[PDB]
């Protein structure tokens, strides 16, 4: 009777903490293993791969786009994806945005992250990048829904990422429910056969 939850919890066991040192000054900001830039690129590609899973249901193909919660559709049909990567609009190149010299970096994904976790609905991070914080589904991503293992409200210290793909409930529509469940089986098969030594992944699909 409520939305269906497909979910991943991702950790980076072989990755160390690192230190963001802001420019021109500012105090050091620690960043947990899974907010390493290379880990975030890997996770974005896993997320996109999930977005492009297709299941076979009799003579139809079922995509996530067919079954996902797209509350702003038909005008914005982007699937709702609650993920830290949506602060970068699920874009490798936004994630790599940086303002810097040959010696110094004035703004980068650290800056954007630190701003967005406090202003998730903002269209402009007020920094030299001027990047939006809104996810590509047109809505905000609250930091406590997509990060775990941090202390207080220091989301930069997160030790796990939470990625959620809401799917329609299809209450009183068993036919479409069949397609959603076929896609969920394919989701499970994919993730259970995805082994990346730099990542641990807990994964669940709706019962």
Numbering used by the authors: 401 to 607
Task: Show me the paper's own sentences about this structure.
Niemann–Pick C1 protein (NPC1) is a membrane protein that primarily resides in late endosomes and lysosomes, and plays an important role in cholesterol homeostasis in the cell. NPC1 is a 13-pass transmembrane glycoprotein that resides primarily in late endosomes and lysosomes. The second luminal domain of NPC1 (NPC1-C) serves as the intracellular receptor for Ebola and Marburg viruses. The viral glycoprotein (GP) interacts with domain C of NPC1 (termed NPC1-C here), which is one of three large luminal loops of the protein.
The goal was to co-crystallize NPC1-C in complex with primed A82V Ebola virus glycoprotein (GP) as part of an effort to explore the basis of the enhanced infectivity of the A82V variant in the 2013–2016 Ebola outbreak in West Africa. Human NPC1-C (residues 371–621) was expressed as a C-terminally polyhistidine-tagged fusion protein in E. coli as insoluble inclusion bodies. After denaturation with urea and a nickel-affinity chromatography step, the protein was refolded at pH 8 using the glutathione redox system to facilitate correct disulfide-bond formation. Although the objective was to obtain a crystal of a protein complex of NPC1-C with the primed and glycosylated form of A82V EBOV GP, the proteins did not co-crystallize regardless of the glycosylation state of NPC1-C, with nonglycosylated NPC1-C crystallizing alone. The overall structure of NPC1-C is similar to other published structures of NPC1, as expected, with root-mean-square deviations on all common Cα atoms for each aligned pair ranging from 0.36 to 0.78 Å.
